């Protein structure tokens, strides 16, 4: 299972997702992202069921951008989090369950506050200082709680993350092959090239 | 224009079509009397068969709806068969959903509501017929309800129906003011058939034999209609008195 980490630093969100795409016995491809930029000021990362994960990502990406061109103005990341929860609710009673766990991090421009939310697959949004899904949770929830200071600057936060991969690598049983990192902060959405 | 060919308000206040259904009623020229006894209800209707070819056993205006409920219909026979069928279905339906024979009152009220939807809808015409339902109910006794193409009804102590009904109307009025009882007192149901037929000959003035009458009688737990032998034998008993 793919790794997918969150952490909410003092004025930025750093999301990180696994590169490995492993269908069947062989690793097909090893440079594929698992994230879709919703809005100029929202990023959504996703992993879970094969093949479901992709369909359910564009399905949200379209419907959200449609509300943004209808009103010439993007919904606050606070609201965007709720909309996802809604469709993941409706899908567990339906004939087919989707089975996708998602992290929404976005930089709230009105409040001038960065926010993170963890929406598990049944359908539960929960605001969190930091989180994860999968087996990732077991290994990084203890490493983060030791060292995370609310005051950290964007650059402490990167250097915390680089401890967290190198952890996963010792204990994990499956390759994941280094992450991609992205920053979402007040100034737009950029990517660190250095793991 | 538009109003005098379908069912919407005139600038009058008066649905034309609806009112025409009432003129429509009296096109068969048949006169009906229904009186109540202590234990029964009688209703009698002239039976006039216009030809030698027509068979006299199939000419009717009394229909048997359930065990305890007969109905006499007044007017054009297409509409009558539509009312009869529809009545029957309802009869059946009631008994299955609450498990006891539909009392008369309920049936009368049901075809009145059912009448009502026909005048408010635009594409159904209302049926040109006046319905008289008779029974000995289980808790109320002898009963008459008479329902009207609009969907009006009310109960009655006796009733008249037809073209020449004003004669019968006013004959009956004299009778109940005099006696000061609701219903003909006599206990037997032979006896109140006798009163009924006699009162008819006298109200329209014209004599009637065994082929010009058609009797229904309703007692407690059985409705029956009388054959030409029992109308004839009852006309004998009338002349001897």
């Amino acid at each position: 299972m793919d790794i997918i980490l969150g952490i909410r630093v003092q004025d930025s969100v750093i999301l990180a997702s696994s590169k490995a795409v492993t269908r069947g016995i062989s690793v097909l491809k090893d440079s594929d992202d698992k994230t879709r930029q919703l809005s100029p000021h929202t990023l959504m990362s996703f992993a879970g069921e094969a093949g479901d994960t992709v369909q359910f990502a564009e399905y949200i990406q379209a419907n959200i951008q449609l509300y943004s061109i209808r009103e010439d103005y993007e919904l606050s990341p606070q609201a965007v989090s709720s909309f996802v929860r809604q469709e993941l609710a409706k899908s567990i009673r339906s004939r087919r369950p989707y089975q996708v766990n998602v992290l929404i991090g976005g930089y709230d421009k009105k409040k001038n506050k960065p926010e993170l939310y963890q929406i598990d697959y049944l359908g539960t949004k929960v605001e969190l200082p930091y989180g994860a899904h999968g087996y990732s949770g077991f290994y990084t929830f203890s490493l983060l709680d030791h060292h995370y200071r609310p005051d950290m600057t964007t650059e402490e936060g990167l250097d915390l993350l680089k401890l967290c991969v190198q952890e996963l690598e010792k204990r994990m049983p499956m390759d994941f092959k280094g992450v991609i990192v992205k920053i979402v902060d007040k100034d737009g959405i950029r990517q660190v090239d250095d793991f | 224009g538009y109003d005098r060919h379908i069912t919407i308000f005139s600038p009058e206040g008066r649905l034309y079509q609806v009112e025409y259904a009432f003129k429509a009623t009296n096109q068969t020229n048949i006169n009906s009397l229904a009186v109540r006894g202590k234990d029964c209800t009688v209703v009698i209707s002239q039976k006039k068969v216009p030809d030698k070819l027509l068979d006299p056993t199939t000419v009717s205006y009394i229909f048997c709806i359930s065990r305890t409920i007969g109905m006499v219909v007044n007017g054009p026979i297409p509409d009558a068969r539509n009312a009869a069928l529809r009545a029957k279905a309802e009869a059946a339906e009631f008994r299955y959903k609450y498990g006891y024979d539909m009392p008369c009152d309920v049936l009368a009220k049901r075809m009145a509501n059912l009448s009502q939807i026909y005048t408010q809808r635009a594409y159904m015409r209302p049926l040109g017929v006046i319905l008289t339902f008779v029974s000995v109910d289980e808790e109320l006794g002898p009963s008459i309800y008479k329902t009207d193409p609009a969907g009006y009804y009310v109960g009655y102590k006796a009733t008249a129906t037809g073209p020449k009904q004003q004669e019968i109307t006013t004959n009956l009025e004299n009778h109940f003011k005099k006696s000061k009882i609701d219903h003909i007192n006599e206990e037997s149901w032979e006896k109140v058939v006798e009163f009924a037929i006699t009162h008819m000959i006298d109200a329209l003035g014209t004599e009637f034999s065994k082929n010009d009458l058609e009797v229904g009688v309703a007692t407690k737990d059985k409705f029956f209609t009388l054959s030409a032998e029992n109308i004839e034998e009852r006309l004998v008993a009338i002349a001897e008195q």
Binding site: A89, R93, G123, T124, V126, G131, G137 | -
Partner: protein
């Protein structure tokens, strides 16, 4: 495993003299991993309080369901809805989907303003009205809670006596249970004011 045990949570409520008190814990997990130290499982529509426990998601959905229903009422009748009335509504939404139902256990506590009566009620998954005039427990340490309160609770209490009982009873039970703890919140609801008080309590 069972849908009801996948995040724990407990809710207790008691009536007292001229006040009621409702209380839960804060913990929202996914099975053995505890996820978050926040998360309220009490919500309040007018001067009614509605605390819902059990299966993670349906707590939430079923909350923006009662938000939606309470709202439309106060626009029709131009008042705030009365607890006696509210109890009927919770049964009636529940029973609507009989099959595939919500795995919840909601508990109502407020005061009728028109008569001054305190008044509590309980439910189940399927959802039936549970009358009482004592106290109602709910959740996954509902068995464990049930003895504890019964023992402590004195028929009728003063608003700050009451606050001692529901406290020790709510604490001790959460420390004999695997999916609860992590602080607890106790509300005391009087005819005029609501206090929200956090409880100092052993993590683990």
């Amino acid at each position: 495993s069972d849908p009801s045990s996948i995040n724990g949570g407990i809710v207790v409520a008691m009536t007292g003299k001229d006040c009621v008190a409702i209380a839960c814990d804060l913990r929202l997990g996914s099975q053995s991993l505890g996820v978050s130290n926040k998360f309220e499982k009490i919500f309040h529509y007018g001067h009614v309080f509605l605390g819902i426990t059990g299966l993670a998601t349906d707590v939430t959905t079923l909350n923006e369901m009662f938000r939606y229903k309470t709202n439309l009422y106060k626009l029709k009748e131009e008042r705030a809805i009365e607890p006696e009335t509210f109890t009927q509504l919770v049964s009636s939404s529940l029973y609507e989907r009989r099959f595939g139902p919500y795995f919840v256990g909601p508990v109502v506590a407020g005061i009728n303003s028109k008569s001054g009566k305190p008044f509590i009620a309980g439910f189940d998954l399927i959802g039936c009205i549970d009358e009482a005039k004592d106290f109602i427990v709910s959740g996954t340490a509902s068995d464990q809670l049930f003895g504890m309160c019964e023992s402590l609770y004195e028929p009728n209490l003063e608003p700050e006596d009451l606050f001692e009982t529901i406290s020790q009873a709510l604490l001790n039970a959460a420390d004999r249970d695997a999916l609860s703890g992590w602080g607890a919140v106790v509300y005391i609801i009087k005819k005029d004011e609501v206090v929200k008080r956090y409880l100092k309590m052993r993590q683990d």
